[PDB]
Amino acid sequence: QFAKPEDAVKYRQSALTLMASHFGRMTPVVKGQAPYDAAQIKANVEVLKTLSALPWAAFGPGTEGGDARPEIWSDAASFKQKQQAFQDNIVKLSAAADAGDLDKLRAAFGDVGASCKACHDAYRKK
Amino acid sequence: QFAKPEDAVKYRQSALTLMASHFGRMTPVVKGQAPYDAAQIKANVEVLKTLSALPWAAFGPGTEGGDARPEIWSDAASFKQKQQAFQDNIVKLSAAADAGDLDKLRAAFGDVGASCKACHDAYRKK
Numbered sequence A, B: 001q002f003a004k005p006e007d008a009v010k011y012r013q014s015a016l017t018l019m020a021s022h023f024g025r026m027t028p029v030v031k032g033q034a035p036y037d038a039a040q041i042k043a044n045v046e047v048l049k050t051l052s053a054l055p056w057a058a059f060g061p062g063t064e065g066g067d068a069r070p071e072i073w074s075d076a077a078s079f080k081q082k083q084q085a086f087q088d089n090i091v092k093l094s095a096a097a098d099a100g101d102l103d104k105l106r107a108a109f110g111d112v113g114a115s116c117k118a119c120h121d122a123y124r125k126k
């Protein structure tokens, strides 16, 4: 699927755009501005779970470009921990959404959002 | 998630790019150029199933733009049938992939690809 590095960059940017949309659209629910519909949130968090696994294999060898910093590949073990923290927080979000637990969901949502920004601060060009 | 029509256009283009990647990457398998790994294809077709439901609600009212033709909204019942044929063919693809049946999978894959092009021919700017 990534014949040239520019195809990996197009894929990962598309996946990240879709993640941002499925994550950010829950902000009014977690802030009490819109009603919590447990079943609809469960379904949206499942879409976000699928999308959240997709960008990383499009940062494979040789796919420098876009707004990715070089240290993604030069400090690969450190990048992997930032990616892992995010993906661990998506597991917690899915557990909260599956349980219908709005306290857990809002806490997990804040942890996901902080881990998006913690990776950006180290690995995304400003 | 689509505060301005340009946000709906960015979302739907991103979803369609991800669909194209998850669909097209199976072409060598269905053409016998790469080995059929039933479990990996099942998992990829599940990603494609999730992605295939996403673009359509970002062609909502008022979201004219991109390479969408106007007749998507002026002939809405006709667009709906093109979208339905595609989504019906994704159900058949998921059934083949879940059953591990490569004859069914390649037949369903051709039907999906034809329905992508049948919508493009009527509804996507050349």
Ligand code: HEC
Binding pocket: A009, A012, A013, A014, A016, A017, A019, A020, A021, A023, A065, A066, A067, A068, A069, A079, A082, A083, A084, A086, A112, A113, A115, A116, A117, A119, A120, A123, A124, A125
């Ligand atoms: C590193 C482990 C990351 C985590 C976790 C998340 N993001 Fe990210 N993001 C990352 C990089 C290296 C880039 C640049 C990719 C490129 O090659 O250009 C991005 C980019 C985005 C974008 C812009 C995509 C675009 O259209 O070009 C968005 C919208 C984005 N990131 C959002 C986002 C969200 C909402 C996250 C958590 C829910 C998230 N990112 C995590 C690296 C990483």
Ligand code: HEC
Binding pocket: B009, B012, B013, B014, B016, B017, B019, B020, B021, B023, B065, B066, B067, B068, B069, B079, B082, B083, B084, B086, B112, B113, B115, B116, B117, B119, B120, B123, B124, B125
């Ligand atoms: C109508 C019912 C469609 C079906 C079924 C599929 N596609 Fe499509 N496609 C459609 C439109 C109206 C557009 C333009 C969207 C816009 O506003 O610009 C598209 C666009 C694409 C693109 C380009 C996305 C981009 O990056 O800008 C791709 C890669 C794409 N379409 C692929 C694709 C595939 C592989 C499909 C079936 C598996 C498929 N499309 C179905 C309308 C419709």
